[PDB]
Design goal:
By secondary structure, the protein is mostly helical. Helices cover 68% and strands 0% of the residues. The structure holds the ligand C[C@H]1CN[C@](C)(C(=O)NC2CC2)CN1C(=O)NCC1CC1. Ligand RJD is lined by residues 30, 32-33, 35, 39-40, 82, 85-86, 96. The PDB classes it as hydrolase/hydrolase inhibitor.
């Protein structure tokens, strides 16, 4: 229905605004664009599903996310990729991991304060009906 397409358009506006607020934060610079294979050639031998904030905006615009849960699966993948690729004790790995955990925790905290729980339940019930 037209009502349903209006629901999904509001979801996209909300996701673009959360993603923009993450992308301008200086702590999250190394998560804003895909890893360059001609700077880190080993990356794609270890990490089987790369993800970054520029790819997330592209996915919003392609109508890939029908719920906030499917968006948070990609924010979780950005954070889990960094914990797996940079697991060592040295300061450079520990700084990347601390920033990855902060990106994940910031996304969840914005959504807890700003997403209405009945708006998410509506999106889940439309998705299940298709
Ligand atoms: C995920 C981040 C952090 N971990 C990596 C291994 C790294 O340390 N890369 C060193 C800088 C070449 C890979 N990576 C990037 O390449 N980000 C590129 C920024 C977005 C433009």
């Amino acid at each position: 229905s037209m009502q349903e397409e209006d629901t999904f358009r509001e979801l996209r506006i909300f996701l673009r605004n959360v993603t923009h607020r993450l992308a301008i934060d200086k702590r999250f610079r190394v998560f804003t664009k895909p890893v360059d294979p001609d700077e880190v050639p080993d990356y794609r031998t270890v990490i089987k599903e790369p993800m970054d904030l520029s790819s997330v905006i592209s996915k919003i615009d392609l109508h890939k996310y029908l719920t906030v849960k499917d968006y948070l699966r990609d924010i979780d993948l950005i954070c889990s990729n960094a914990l797996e690729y940079n697991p060592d004790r040295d300061p450079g790995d520990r700084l990347i991991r601390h920033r990855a955990c902060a990106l994940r925790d910031t996304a969840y905290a914005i959504i807890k304060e700003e997403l209405d729980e009945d708006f998410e339940q509506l999106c889940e019930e439309i998705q299940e009906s298709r």
